[PDB]
Amino acid sequence: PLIVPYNLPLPGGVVPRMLITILGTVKPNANRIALDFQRGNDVAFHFNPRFNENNRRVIVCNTKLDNNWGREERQSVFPFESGKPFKIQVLVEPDHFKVAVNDAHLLQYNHRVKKLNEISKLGISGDIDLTSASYTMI
Ligand SMILES: CNc1c(F)c(F)c(-c2cn([C@H]3[C@@H](O)[C@@H](CO)O[C@@H](Sc4ccc(C)cc4)[C@@H]3O)nn2)c(F)c1F
């Protein structure tokens, strides 16, 4: 029952072995979800489930630098379902963010923004009820 959009500070930025866990439930008739790992105004890693992009469900990932989006990375494996509870786990690895949903590996996103310790907030937004958002070291 957290407020959405939700800002989760990541003190000191991210680092390999940091695991971020998001628990929520997708709203009925959802259109989109977004996770935005931010370096100031830049978005180091945008993870964007789209429930209806031309009648397809797709996850779009990208980076925003100086207000410009970069090259999209797309994943048609789509583990979210309207109305249903989910778990997103984002593990920071040396070279990439590694994302699993409901305990199944989904995608990796190579670090474009390389100052990991400056990626010090995570925004969580979209068509969800947000239950919890937290981090730990593994
Ligand atoms: C309900 N909450 C919510 C919200 F309020 C939002 F504003 C966004 C959102 C989505 N985007 C963008 C982002 O997805 C990007 C990923 O490549 O694509 C662009 S299109 C585009 C334009 C130019 C180029 C060069 C490439 C692609 C999108 O505009 N920015 N904000 C969101 F995802 C949300 F879920």
Of the CA atoms within 13 Å of residue 20, those in its CB half-sphere come to: 26
Residue 40 labelled as part of a binding site? no
Q: Can you tell me the distance from the alpha carbon of 10 to that of 1, in angstroms, rounded to the nearest whole number?
A: 20
Residue 83 labelled as part of a binding site? no
Domain limits of the chain? 1-138
Q: Can you tell me the distance from the alpha carbon of 84 to that of 123, in angstroms, rounded to the nearest whole number?
A: 21
- Helices then strands, counting H and E runs in the chain, come out as 0, 12
Q: Separation of 35 CA from ligand 1 center, angstroms?
A: 11
Q: What is the largest CA-CA distance in the chain?
A: 40
Q: What is the resolution of this structure in A?
A: 1.1
Ligand 1 site: residues with CB under 6 angstroms? Answer: 32-34, 46, 48, 60, 62, 69, 72, 125-126
Q: Separation of 125 CA from ligand 1 center, angstroms?
A: 11
Looking at 1.10.3720.10, 3.20.10.10, 3.40.50.880, 2.60.120.200, the CATH number of the domain 1-138 comes to 2.60.120.200
Nearest CA to ligand 1 atom 28: 69
Please tell me the experimental approach by which this structure was elucidated. X-ray
Contact 97/107 with Cβ under 8 angstroms? Answer: no
